[model samples]
Structures are given as C-alpha cells and as structure tokens.
Target: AQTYVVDRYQDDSNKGSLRWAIEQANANPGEASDILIQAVGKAPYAIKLNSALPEIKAPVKIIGTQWDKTGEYIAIDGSNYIKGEGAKACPGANPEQYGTNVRTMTLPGLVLRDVNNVTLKGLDIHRFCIGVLINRSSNNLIQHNRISNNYGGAGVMLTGDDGQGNPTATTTNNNKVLDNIFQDNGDGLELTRGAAFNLIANNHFVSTKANPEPSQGIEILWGNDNAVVGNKFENYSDGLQINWGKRNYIAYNEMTNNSIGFNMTGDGNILDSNKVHGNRIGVAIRSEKDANAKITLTKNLIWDNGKDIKRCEAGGSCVPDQRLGAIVFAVPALEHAGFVGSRGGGVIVDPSKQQKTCTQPNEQGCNAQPNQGIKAPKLTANKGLVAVEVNGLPNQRYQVEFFSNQNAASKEAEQYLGAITVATDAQGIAKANWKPSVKVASITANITDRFGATSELSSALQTK
Candidate 1:
C-alpha cells in the first residue's frame, strides 16, 4: 500500500513536502496507503499553509491527485492561510476555529487524529481554518475533493478532540462524504461531537458568500445515525439546520434558494422526500418544546414560499401543526382522497379534471402507473467498459444490477457495483458490461423480475 509521491508544494527540505509526504506515508505501519499529491499540467499545486500540517496519525491515503490527464480538475492550493480568522478570537470558540491565532498564526488544512481506513482523494481545499478536520476519526473517505473559495471554517468537519467545538471522546463513526465540491464556505459539511454513521452524499453546496450570510449546506450538530442523503442545497442560510439530532434521515434533498428550508431543532427527525423550492421559510419548526412533538414531515415538495410552515420560533403556530407531516400537493376542490398538510397532510394532483384537478403545491399528474413502468438503463462510461442498455420483454429474463453509486446526488439503493443476468434480444432489449477499478460518478441500472419485481431507479449513467 505504498504510492506516496508529492512532486511539490514546498516544505522544501523536508523533501518537497505535503507535510513531508504525509510524514513519510505515515511511516507505513501497513495496510491503508497512497498519497500521490496532485500534478500533471495546467498549473496549480499551491500549498501555502504558512504553518500547520501533521497529525494524520496513520493508515495514509491522502490522495491529493485531483484529476488531470484530461480528466480535468487541476488545482490543489491550500490558499496561503494566515490564520483561522478572528471570530473575536476564542471566547466560546469554534466560530469556525482554525487553531492558533492568539495574535494570528494558522493551520488545519488537514488533521485527522486516530485514523483507520483514511482516504482523502483529489485535494483542492482552500483558504484554511478547518478544511478537513476529522479528529478521532473512524472509517474515513472524504472523496472527490474541491472544497472551495474559503474565507474560513469547515469544508468538512467531524469532531472529537475536545477543543472548542468539543469532540466528545471519539465516536466519529463510519464516515464517507462522497462526491465533494462545496463552494464558498463557513460550513459545507459539518457533524459536530459524536458524529454518527456519516454519508452526506453527492455534494455541490454553494453559498459563495455575498455578505457574511453563509452557513449550512449540511450541519447536524451533536449527531446520530447521520445520512443527509442526495444533497444539492443552493445559496445557503439553512438547507438543513438541526441542533440536537437523533435517528436523522433528511432524505432525497434539493432544498432550493435558501434562507429557511427545513430547520428542526431536534428529536427523532425525518423530513423525508424533500424538494422544498425557492425558500424564505418552507418548513421550519425551531422547537421550543419540540414544536409539533418529535418532528416528521413526509413526502415533501413545498413550492415557492415566503412562508409555508413555521410553528414555534417567530410567533409560532399559524395552524397546520400536529407536527406537520404528509404533503404531495396539487389539490384545491378534490373529490375522493381527502387529507392535506397538517399531520394527516396528504394530497396528489391532476388525474384528469374531476374537481378542478388540484392546484400546484407541485402539480402532479403525468399519469402513467401501469405496473409502475420500468426503463432504467442507458449507461456509458469509457476507459475499460461499463456500458449497458435495457428495455426488456422480447425474451425477458431480466435481473441486471449495476447500481454503482458515489455521485450525481448520492444513490445507495443497496450500493451495488456489479450484478448481471440479462436475456432480451429480439428488439425488446437488454445489454450489459462492467469492469471498473476507479472513477464512476454515476452508474445505475436495476431490473429484477424473477418474481421479486423491482425497478424505479435508473438515470445517472455518466461514469468514466
């Protein structure tokens, strides 16, 4: 497990350092390794740390080899950090703390204590204060890096060091953080204290700071069962703001233009099936007593809002509280299926004008559920095959399964990597192939009909 080769980033004399090639590849104690530091064309190998670098312990694999061989992404600068920046210099601390700055002296572009399966691919971590701090780590993997335009504080942080933000004796469990690219930061991915089974997938969080207002594209303070799945939170202020966390699962996310889009204070949470559009306030319950009792907003899709649902923070209750759950809109004067937004909240629209076919909460009705259809296969990922195509029904015997996830909005429906059993060729279609060892930012196809029946996830086939 030896690949260490940091070309240059100047620590000059320590033998051209990236902290002296991860302290000589964590002095190889055996097993997890590889720190091929970024290079190969189009400039940008900047590592202006000024100070601070060393504490990854072992199990090395800080692969700063961020794309280039025409695979793109050719920069790995740590933005000459001058210090974590003054948040009035540590009184209550963790104002995105970057370490030493009693007068100004920086660090923390990487610091992983108590390592284990460590793997920090494709580096591009910017102006540092806390670009990749994972104290008392466990099962790490922060993949596909590109932590953007830093002004300081957390581009990825899961703690347990007991410093300011406290880490609570290491419980930073099962980390993953796949598909990274968090622009303008203050907090792009943060799981404070005993961070749990982390997975925060398919990242692309942006808050490219405009004023000072930028924070939350993922912040589960004091976590548990972590999994902010399918992320894509735009211009942030709150694309997910939890404070106490427990049994978390803010599912299938897409929290649009933010300022407020799902802010639960804590307790057995589950704001499932999210897609809260243009926000100013779309589903906020800042608990005063757990607001609607143990929060649970299912099947969400709350549209254009200036105010959609806010219970106990700004004047609290405006009715629609029972802890607000159930929502899948487009109803106005319906006829059969009753129940909508409040607790029994239930609604589905347009099936063909019967009672004015609902009215936009996310207007539905693209009607077509004949056995729930199935046509998920149109893959194409070069560099040693990964192709596939399916329609099946000519000879039919489908069983294809190649759900290679890790990008295009994190899919883990059984996190597959390979499985095939096709049989369709008379023009009904079913083709297959797979042979990958690296790179795959979208690859899906799952068809099973040996009577077990399954298929509804297929679309994200651009892996190379």
Candidate 2:
C-alpha cells in the first residue's frame, strides 16, 4: 500500500536507498507495496551493486523511472560484485578454490525468490549472471525493460527451488514476460526445472554488433505447458529450443537468421502459425526416443531455409509421421507419413479425423488452393542462367521450387532443381533469375505461399 523511493546510489539501509526501500516494502504485510528507483542528481544514473541485492521475498512492485532529458531507464550494474567462479578443469574438483577467480557476476541484478504478484518495469539491467531471476515465483509481470549483456546467464530466468545452474524440482507457474527487449544475453529467457504455464509474449530477442552473439533466443530445458507466442527471435544460434519440455505451445513467432529457427526434443509440443525462415535448419525435431516424441505443426510458414524440416541428427529416432500438417515436405523420407489436420496450439491432442476446410471455429487446417497455379509463368534461358517471371498474389511472398521433366506430365519422381523465394509487387508480378546446377531438357515449377500453401505445377517449358 506504500510507495518507497530510491534516490541514492548507496546500498545501505538509509532513507533513500533501494535496499532501504525494499526493507520498508517488505515490512508491509497487508498489500503489495511499490518501490520507485528515481534519479535525484544527474539525469541518467547507474546504481552500482557492491554485492548481490537483498532477495525479494514479499509481493512488491519495483518501478524504475526513465530520465526526461535522455529518455534512458535507470541502470542497475553488477560490475563491482565479483560473483563468477574461476575457470575450472573440473567443476567439483575444488569448489572453494575456484571462487577466488572473478570474471563476471554470477548473481542476478534482481532476484525474485519465492514471491508473487511482483512487477518489474522500466529498468535497464545488465552485466550479471541473469538480469532478472524468478525463482519459485508466480503471477509476476516483467514488461518494457531492457535486459541485456548478461553473458554468464539469461536475461530473465525462471526456475524452481533449486535455483539457477541446478536441476529444477518444483514449479514456477503463471508468470508473464511481455514486451521486453533482450539484447546480447546468454539466452533471452530461460525456463527450466518445472517452470510451467508461463506466458512469454511480444518480446524482441536481438543481437548487436558486440563481441559474442546471443546463444539462444529462448531455451526451455525441463518444463511443460508454457506458452511462447508473438515474439521476434533473430540472430541467435538457436532462436527457440525445447530441449526437454513437453506440450509447450509455440505460436505466432517470427524466427529468422538463426542457425536453427525452432529446435525440439521433448514430446507433444505444438508449433502453430509461426514464420520460420532464413535459417540453416527451420524446424529440427531431435527426439532421442521415437515412441513418445511427437511434434505437431499447424499453419506454420517455413520457407527459404536451408532445409525447412529436418531430423536433428542422422539416424535419430524422431518419427516423421508425428509431425502433421501441409508444411511437412514431400521428400522420400517423409512422403509416406500422410498429411493430417491440425487444430493449432493449446490443445494437446490433435483431432483424430481430418477436416477438409478450416470452417470450424478455432481450427487451423488447410493449405494452398487445390487448382490455383501461378499466372503466365514464363521462362527465359540465357546461357546457363534462366529468368523466370510470374503473376502471384500481390504484396505476398512465395517459394518457387523448380524441377526437371522430359515429357509435359508432372512426375512425382522428378529431378529436383532447387527452390527460390520471390516477393510480388503491388501488381502481383514477380521476377527472378537462377542457374540450374543440373542439366534439364524441360523445366516445371510450383509456387508455395508464406502460409505453407502450394500451388499446382505450371506448364512445362523446354530449356534446350
């Protein structure tokens, strides 16, 4: 019910310090109190943490005021606190001896340990093991903050009672991380150790021109039933990975320019309406066991990737039939799987029977129009290069795949040439030039829109 003010740089129990404000907020037992971190002297200021700040155990809201002159949020730096251990050949060889080396702060800038109904907003937290550590906490909101440069750990981490760097045993549920900007962190947001039912939405995971890029945009190690939706993940090695999480709903995310756009290992995870493009591998299903490893794909636009869908490793036990949808490629390995209907994310079990149209409410089935093909797709060959022009849906993106055929009839076993991404102008016209690596007597192509809908093959044109 009270609002405590933080107007000093010191960490003492004085009237205007943050530590004092937290203590005052914690003393109130009736309702959740508020603490405002405001600058009293200069416009923009940094509050140096000599050591780890006191862990927040009470339901409290901490608000950092932005500077009016520069529009900068107050910075909480962990530079003075030496929390990282020295490099060790073996971690358990000498735990106490490794503590002597000081590389980075292992402690988080802000720790929400065993608390609920807490809110963190408008704070620029950096250079710690984790910017914000939510340990055994629930019903919290982390919004509109810059959580960056925590190379030692994630920008924001949610874990159980064992805490960070340990196996999670308990649950931290119903927390919401929304509208935050995460830059150059170890991982943007890490949910581990039974962190369930949390919502991660509308966040931007970005990388800068800094030395080391972010490792993963988001990594869910050991959790389930979490919702990661409407986030932009770019420039990380792995955009979003579910190593051991089950039944997580991943939808409406735009993941591009990463090594792997979306990687999964756990069973029964649903990926719906996501745009995963421009990555080495678009969606990697790397389940060690084939029995319970089933991933559901629904209405996802996966294109312009090195390979749209792939098994994580050679001879991996991941079954291709478990991935149901039109987005699954028509390759020899996956051709026999047969397409099925999808009902989007949030529902654990896919509908047993197929539904032709997405007429039913909340259904997310259906691919490209059955008889619709590109209009007037003309091909011109100049030496080894071939120029292609077509009319498609206006202002839309398409993936055109080329193949070689001797007769005019489209062959199921046609010689594969390659695929290219084309964007149409306002007039619905697209043009591109490509060189075929293999010689072809005649050429035919098909266009697939960004919604995983494929058009029928166009008329074959002679190349020679």
| CA lDDT of every candidate | 0.57, 0.64
Identify the candidate with maximal lDDT: 2
Model 1 misplaced stretches (Cα beyond 4 Å): 1-14, 19-21, 24-55, 58-135, 138-154, 159-169, 173-187, 196-216, 221-234, 243-262, 268-278, 286-464
Clash pairs, candidate 2, are none
Model 1 lDDT, residue 365, Cα: 45
lDDT of 1 by residue, 1-464 (tens): 37767777665437656777777777775756677776744455566665667777788877765563434443445555343243221112423323211111124577787677788777777766567778677888887788865444456777654555554634577888888888866557777776787788878787753413255677676676778778888766667667666667778888776656665545566666677766655555442222222445444545454544322211112334322221111111112122131210122334443322222344354322212234455767666687777785678787676654454544322244556788887887877777755566755565654433334345557544
lDDT of 2 by residue, 31-127 (tens): 6888888876775677877877888877888888763335577778876774443222111112332210111224678888767889988788877
Candidate 2 ranges beyond 4 A from true positions: 67-71, 83-106, 161-170, 209-213, 307-464
**Deviation of model 1 at 28, angstroms:** 12
| TM-score of candidate 1 against the unseen true structure | 0.29
